[PDB]
Motif scaffolding. Structure first.
Motif, PDB file in Angstrom:
ATOM      1  N   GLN A   1       4.416  25.526   6.049  1.00 31.74           N
ATOM      2  CA  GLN A   1       4.417  24.208   6.669  1.00 31.74           C
ATOM      3  C   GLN A   1       5.156  24.234   7.999  1.00 31.74           C
ATOM      4  N   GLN A   2       6.233  25.018   8.084  1.00 33.78           N
ATOM      5  CA  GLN A   2       6.941  25.177   9.349  1.00 33.78           C
ATOM      6  C   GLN A   2       6.068  25.864  10.387  1.00 33.78           C
ATOM      7  N   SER A   3       5.266  26.844   9.964  1.00 30.79           N
ATOM      8  CA  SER A   3       4.300  27.456  10.866  1.00 30.79           C
ATOM      9  C   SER A   3       3.267  26.450  11.339  1.00 30.79           C
ATOM     10  N   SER A   4       2.832  25.551  10.462  1.00 24.11           N
ATOM     11  CA  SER A   4       2.045  24.405  10.873  1.00 24.11           C
ATOM     12  C   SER A   4       2.984  23.360  11.473  1.00 24.11           C
ATOM     13  N   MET A   5       2.423  22.233  11.907  1.00 23.53           N
ATOM     14  CA  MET A   5       3.132  21.205  12.669  1.00 23.53           C
ATOM     15  C   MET A   5       3.774  21.763  13.933  1.00 23.53           C
ATOM     16  N   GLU A   6       3.479  23.012  14.268  1.00 22.28           N
ATOM     17  CA  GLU A   6       3.725  23.596  15.573  1.00 22.28           C
ATOM     18  C   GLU A   6       2.445  24.060  16.235  1.00 22.28           C
ATOM     19  N   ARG A   7       1.510  24.612  15.460  1.00 23.93           N
ATOM     20  CA  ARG A   7       0.184  24.899  15.984  1.00 23.93           C
ATOM     21  C   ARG A   7      -0.554  23.616  16.332  1.00 23.93           C
ATOM     22  N   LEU A   8      -0.368  22.562  15.534  1.00 21.28           N
ATOM     23  CA  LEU A   8      -0.979  21.275  15.849  1.00 21.28           C
ATOM     24  C   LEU A   8      -0.381  20.678  17.116  1.00 21.28           C
ATOM     25  N   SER A   9       0.947  20.707  17.236  1.00 15.39           N
ATOM     26  CA  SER A   9       1.600  20.110  18.397  1.00 15.39           C
ATOM     27  C   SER A   9       1.265  20.873  19.671  1.00 15.39           C
ATOM     28  N   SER A  10       1.423  22.196  19.647  1.00 18.10           N
ATOM     29  CA  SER A  10       1.143  22.994  20.833  1.00 18.10           C
ATOM     30  C   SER A  10      -0.345  23.047  21.139  1.00 18.10           C
ATOM     31  N   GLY A  11      -1.185  23.070  20.108  1.00 14.46           N
ATOM     32  CA  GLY A  11      -2.605  23.268  20.276  1.00 14.46           C
ATOM     33  C   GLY A  11      -3.045  24.714  20.254  1.00 14.46           C
ATOM     34  N   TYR A  12      -2.108  25.656  20.222  1.00 14.89           N
ATOM     35  CA  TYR A  12      -2.406  27.079  20.148  1.00 14.89           C
ATOM     36  C   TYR A  12      -2.021  27.608  18.775  1.00 14.89           C
ATOM     37  N   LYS A  13      -2.942  28.326  18.131  1.00 12.89           N
ATOM     38  CA  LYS A  13      -2.577  29.048  16.921  1.00 12.89           C
ATOM     39  C   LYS A  13      -1.816  30.328  17.221  1.00 12.89           C
ATOM     40  N   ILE A  14      -1.744  30.733  18.485  1.00 13.90           N
ATOM     41  CA  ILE A  14      -0.984  31.901  18.908  1.00 13.90           C
ATOM     42  C   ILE A  14       0.086  31.407  19.870  1.00 13.90           C
ATOM     43  N   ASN A  15       1.322  31.321  19.386  1.00 15.91           N
ATOM     44  CA  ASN A  15       2.459  30.964  20.224  1.00 15.91           C
ATOM     45  C   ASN A  15       3.607  31.953  20.142  1.00 15.91           C
ATOM     46  N   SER A  16       3.624  32.837  19.150  1.00 16.73           N
ATOM     47  CA  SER A  16       4.568  33.938  19.081  1.00 16.73           C
ATOM     48  C   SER A  16       3.810  35.198  18.697  1.00 16.73           C
ATOM     49  N   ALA A  17       4.340  36.347  19.115  1.00 13.90           N
ATOM     50  CA  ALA A  17       3.666  37.611  18.845  1.00 13.90           C
ATOM     51  C   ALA A  17       3.558  37.906  17.356  1.00 13.90           C
ATOM     52  N   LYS A  18       4.448  37.341  16.538  1.00 15.19           N
ATOM     53  CA  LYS A  18       4.408  37.603  15.105  1.00 15.19           C
ATOM     54  C   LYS A  18       3.161  37.032  14.444  1.00 15.19           C
ATOM     55  N   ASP A  19       2.554  35.998  15.028  1.00 17.26           N
ATOM     56  CA  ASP A  19       1.335  35.440  14.453  1.00 17.26           C
ATOM     57  C   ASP A  19       0.172  36.416  14.583  1.00 17.26           C
ATOM     58  N   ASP A  20      -0.031  36.965  15.782  1.00 13.24           N
ATOM     59  CA  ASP A  20      -1.086  37.955  16.000  1.00 13.24           C
ATOM     60  C   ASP A  20      -0.679  38.793  17.211  1.00 13.24           C
ATOM     61  N   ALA A  21      -0.163  39.996  16.951  1.00 13.80           N
ATOM     62  CA  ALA A  21       0.258  40.865  18.044  1.00 13.80           C
ATOM     63  C   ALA A  21      -0.922  41.257  18.925  1.00 13.80           C
ATOM     64  N   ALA A  22      -2.030  41.676  18.312  1.00 17.00           N
ATOM     65  CA  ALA A  22      -3.213  42.026  19.091  1.00 17.00           C
ATOM     66  C   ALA A  22      -3.786  40.810  19.800  1.00 17.00           C
ATOM     67  N   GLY A  23      -3.799  39.659  19.124  1.00 17.43           N
ATOM     68  CA  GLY A  23      -4.337  38.456  19.731  1.00 17.43           C
ATOM     69  C   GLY A  23      -3.568  38.009  20.955  1.00 17.43           C
ATOM     70  N   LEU A  24      -2.253  38.230  20.967  1.00 14.34           N
ATOM     71  CA  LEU A  24      -1.449  37.836  22.117  1.00 14.34           C
ATOM     72  C   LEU A  24      -1.859  38.600  23.369  1.00 14.34           C
ATOM     73  N   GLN A  25      -2.097  39.907  23.239  1.00 13.57           N
ATOM     74  CA  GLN A  25      -2.441  40.716  24.404  1.00 13.57           C
ATOM     75  C   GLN A  25      -3.776  40.290  24.997  1.00 13.57           C
ATOM     76  N   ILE A  26      -4.805  40.181  24.155  1.00 12.34           N
ATOM     77  CA  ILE A  26      -6.133  39.853  24.659  1.00 12.34           C
ATOM     78  C   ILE A  26      -6.164  38.427  25.192  1.00 12.34           C
ATOM     79  N   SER A  27      -5.448  37.507  24.541  1.00  7.32           N
ATOM     80  CA  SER A  27      -5.407  36.130  25.024  1.00  7.32           C
ATOM     81  C   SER A  27      -4.683  36.029  26.360  1.00  7.32           C
ATOM     82  N   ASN A  28      -3.575  36.757  26.523  1.00  5.33           N
ATOM     83  CA  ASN A  28      -2.871  36.735  27.802  1.00  5.33           C
ATOM     84  C   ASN A  28      -3.723  37.335  28.909  1.00  5.33           C
ATOM     85  N   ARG A  29      -4.429  38.427  28.614  1.00  4.52           N
ATOM     86  CA  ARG A  29      -5.303  39.025  29.616  1.00  4.52           C
ATOM     87  C   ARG A  29      -6.438  38.081  29.984  1.00  4.52           C
ATOM     88  N   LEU A  30      -7.020  37.412  28.987  1.00  2.24           N
ATOM     89  CA  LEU A  30      -8.052  36.422  29.264  1.00  2.24           C
ATOM     90  C   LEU A  30      -7.495  35.266  30.081  1.00  2.24           C
TER      91      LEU A  30
END
Lengths: 54, 54
Positions: free
Chosen positions: B25-54
């Motif tokens: 629940q703590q992980s939620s109510m932050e993805r909703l507020s920010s609008g990003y499911k990727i806001n820290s590298a711990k959520d998806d390390a690979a996703g952070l790199q490709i999203s930042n490059r995009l």
């Protein structure tokens, strides 16, 4: 789909077509006023050289 | 052979699942507020790199 708020892909594509249509309209309204379909070189490179010679 | 007060095994079991739930629940109510499911590298390390490059 990704029902999100941070990215509006549908808005973005409609933006590109709105700009393309607006610049197409702005391409007109200056051919009407000037009375020529070619007033800048970008309109017709071939036409500019030949027309100046006639 | 087993009824006591010093150790409450069921209390720790429900407690463990309590924080396992409030952390999700703590992980939620932050993805909703920010609008990003990727806001820290711990959520998806690979996703952070490709999203930042995009």
């Amino acid at each position: 789909m990704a029902v999100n708020v941070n990215t509006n892909v549908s808005a973005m594509t409609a933006q590109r077509y709105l700009t393309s249509a607006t610049n197409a309209q702005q391409s007109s309204m200056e051919r009407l006023s000037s009375g020529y379909k070619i007033n800048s070189a970008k309109d017709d490179a071939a036409g500019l050289q030949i027309s100046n010679r006639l």
